[PDB]
Amino acid sequence: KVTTVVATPGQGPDRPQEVSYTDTKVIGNGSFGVVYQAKLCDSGELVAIKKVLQDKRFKNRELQIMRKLDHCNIVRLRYFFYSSKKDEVYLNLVLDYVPETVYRVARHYSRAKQTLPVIYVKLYMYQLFRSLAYIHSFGICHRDIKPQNLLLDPDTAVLKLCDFGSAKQLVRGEPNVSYICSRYYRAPELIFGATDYTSSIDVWSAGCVLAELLLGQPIFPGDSGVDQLVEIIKVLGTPTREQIREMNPNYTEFKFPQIKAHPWTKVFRPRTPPEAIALCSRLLEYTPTARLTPLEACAHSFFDELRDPNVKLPNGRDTPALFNFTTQELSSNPPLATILIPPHARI
């Protein structure tokens, strides 16, 4: 059918308007809710619609977060509307449709027994760090960074971060749930039960994605919460007493067998670009404050090729926009802008 609703622009207004869509198709279902694919009647533009059951006498965290965001590497909230079991309310997030995910692309190469071309690893990870730089500048932590939540336009190689259903604006002093993030990408402080963690848990998860892109498989495939730490210890060894305090000050373990870290150069295939391993070693640190900030990660030597005037996608096309930085995005370290924006990128 042609479905017509009254929906509020995600941008603001916020003044409601009639929005019509067709070709409705279920493309996702979970405990979170249902995701549809649809086609807008006046534009023809494809959209995704995320339908979530809403506690009617409460506000939606994901909505409040999504309304604040406007960034080329974050899925755009076009509209939102409510409906409508009798007295049940569903919130509908209308998002720009993006056909692929980093997960499905990486899985393709993985099943073909080959590694994703290094240029894409640079492209996707850099766009990931940008999206993180953006949301962290608001104090918003995603808390569910994984390849499945990274959307890809296969033609343009644009990456958009999605699924803010776990996201939270973190306030220091106010405790946060520890059992969060998909297991393989869960920061070690979370496993140790930290409630005072920071946005740096997203950087850990970003490091896991990077490593996965290099390995063709998850770096830490834990079968459970405890086994997740077992997996981490195989690479990083055991944390020092100081790293434990840094992760969770409320956790104490007076005695445990110390284990040395495995060399990063042996974690990855011999032909893994040494700069990718270097970046990875600065993201997958026990000490949360020792991890690179997303901006610092964007400025890393590994992304040097992206700042090269003559860089092209393997398909001949030019790369997506990479240097359109805003004051908000650069706010954690404003001077880094002269390194991040190379001379050919300026107006």
Binding site: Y179, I191, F192, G193, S224, G225, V226, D227, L229, V230, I233, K234, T238, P239, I244, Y251, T252, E253, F254, K255, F256, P257, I259
Partner: peptide, 24 residues
């Protein structure tokens, strides 16, 4: 390791047990 992880964290034996499970 949901109630198990909780126990490990509460009893202060998380690392000790993880190291054991390394197997070792």
């Amino acid at each position: 390791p949901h109630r198990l992880l909780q126990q490990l964290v509460l009893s202060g034996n998380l690392i000790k047990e993880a190291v054991r499970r390394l197997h070792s």
